[PDB]
From a paper:
The dynamic assembly of actin is controlled by the hydrolysis of ATP, bound to the center of the molecule. Here, we report the crystal structures of the three mutant actins bound to AMPPNP or ADP-Pi determined at a resolution of 1.35–1.55 Å, which are stabilized in the F-form conformation with the aid of the fragmin F1 domain.
In Q137A, two water molecules replaced the side-chain oxygen and nitrogen of Gln137 almost exactly at their positions; consequently, the active site structure, including the W1 position, is essentially conserved. As a result, W1 loses its direct interactions with actin residues. The distance between W1 and PG is 3.2 Å, and it is the same as that for sWT_AMPPNP, while the distance between W1 and W2 is slightly longer, from 2.4 Å to 2.8 Å. However, this expectation is inconsistent with biochemical data, as discussed in the “Discussion” section. The polar interactions in the active site of Q137A_ADP-Pi were highly similar to those of cWT_ADP-Pi, and His161 was flipped (χ1 = 64° and χ2 = −89°). In the crystal structure of Q137A_AMPPNP, the two water molecules replacing the side-chain atoms of Gln137, WOε1, and WNε2, had a continuous electron density and were separated by only 2.5 Å (indicated by an arrow in Figure 7D). Thus, the replacement of the Gln137 side-chain atoms by the water molecules, WOε1 and WNε2, may disturb the hydrolysis reaction because of the increased fluctuation of the water network in the catalytic site in which the two water molecules, W1 and WOε1, do not bond directly to any actin residue.
Author numbering:
A (entry chain B): 7 to 141, 144 to 160
B (entry chain A): 5 to 41, 51 to 375
The structure:
Amino acid sequence: YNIADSNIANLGTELEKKVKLEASQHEDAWKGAGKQVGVEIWRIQQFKVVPVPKKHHGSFYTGDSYIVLSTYHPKTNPDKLAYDVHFWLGAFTTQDEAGTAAYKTVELDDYLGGLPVQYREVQGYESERFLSLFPGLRILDGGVETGFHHVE
Amino acid sequence: TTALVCDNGSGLVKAGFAGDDAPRAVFPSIVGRPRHQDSYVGDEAQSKRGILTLKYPIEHGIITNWDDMEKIWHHTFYNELRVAPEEHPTLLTEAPLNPKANREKMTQIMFETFNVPAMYVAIAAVLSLYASGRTTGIVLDSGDGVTHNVPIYEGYALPHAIMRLDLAGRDLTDYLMKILTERGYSFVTTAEREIVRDIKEKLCYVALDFENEMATAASSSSLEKSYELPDGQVITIGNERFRCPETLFQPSFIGMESAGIHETTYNSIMKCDIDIRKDLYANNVLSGGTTMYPGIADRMQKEITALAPSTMKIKIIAPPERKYSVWIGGSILASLSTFQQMWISKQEYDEAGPSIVHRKCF
Ligand SMILES: Nc1ncnc2c1ncn2[C@@H]1O[C@H](COP(=O)(O)OP(=O)(O)NP(=O)(O)O)[C@@H](O)[C@H]1O
Ligand SMILES: [Ca+2]
Ligand SMILES: [Ca+2]
Ligand SMILES: [Mg+2]
């Protein structure tokens, strides 16, 4: 099997990136994101990307999944912005929440032109980079209910 | 409005509604016609298997009988799910490296025959990766017809590194049918093949060390298992239990010179940029029914460790519901309004025709 004349001949192209950039324009959560240095946090709630109030940043429900966008000045230019996007997966988050967090992390990457570097942060396996965003972390029992309907 | 998710496997249809945690209809992708030489679909063909010859309209992930595939889709909508397809945006799945005409005809039939309002054709392995909650990893997907490796980095598949093998569950079933004759048991017909498939799913396993396991099986009966046939006859199977899926690691068992699944996985990783291989090695995700053999994850871990640098962390992820990971990833993505924004609408199809599928579905 070769790529030519196949259904992956358009993967990796400018057209793929164009189509996905356009799709990311339809998520209200990204409007105004990554405009200044700081940490922005959303939680997945029944497939939706919901902002977390600033006063609660750093507290994470073990039952839930989150997207954390860290905006900072890169070494190359003190007046420009670079991005780390972490998605945080609670020990008890459900499969719909983690999958949506993963997909929407890519979408936020798309929205920001591919610049963000992505980090998968499972509870108990959080990277040094992630830990350093909260100089700390507070894990809370509970979380919001799955968006899945359970097929009996 | 609820989207339909239809994972059209070579062997099984998995169909249901976006937002559900599992497919509501799972049935064999078969059309049956009288063995004595007007048709039956799915479970009802399996129900009349005694008088029918069974044909699969998908071979190695490619639709080769479009008339019978239409029957399968019609059965899925009207007889199983009991929905009107013109009311439901529909997500379909496909193996990577299929010829472009396959999804062109998928799109044509969905819009012109079933009048769906919108549709999308997704690469199965990408859906499995998201179902596992990852954006980076390498999926080994193995069903009834296709085994493929797709490495994915930050949500984008790396097309130059995608690997595909025409060796999957149906070949393993056929091989089990053949070697069960060395023991005296005759399985030859399309009906008998489904009995052997069941033996395979219930009793086979991947040996951690194939040579040692063959010697264990020759020394005593400790690895033998009994299996009750429909007529009540109890047969005994021994080294066939692990010789059958050994073929995935040694394709020469069925006369193929191909690399085994451990080598194709390694080779796929090695076609990726050096600095991301680390993340692929630590995130090998298994997907599909032919990855359900007991022992397969441990064997993959052993074999990849032998091929990879000694300092490399290797991890095989084997989700317990991986028979349905592709479908579940589809259920998640089809629940997202931004993903559905990318779908082909009927108006867009009326303007552009089948070629639009390649400009919208990635
Ligand atoms: N427990 C099991 N152990 C081994 N094989 C199994 C098991 N359960 C199912 N299978 C095989 O898995 C295959 C069906 O898996 P599935 O992932 O549904 O394939 P598919 O999607 O229909 N085909 P494909 O077009 O290749 O993706 C058949 O060959 C089954 O016999
Ligand atoms: Ca939750
Ligand atoms: Ca990026
Ligand atoms: Mg499949």
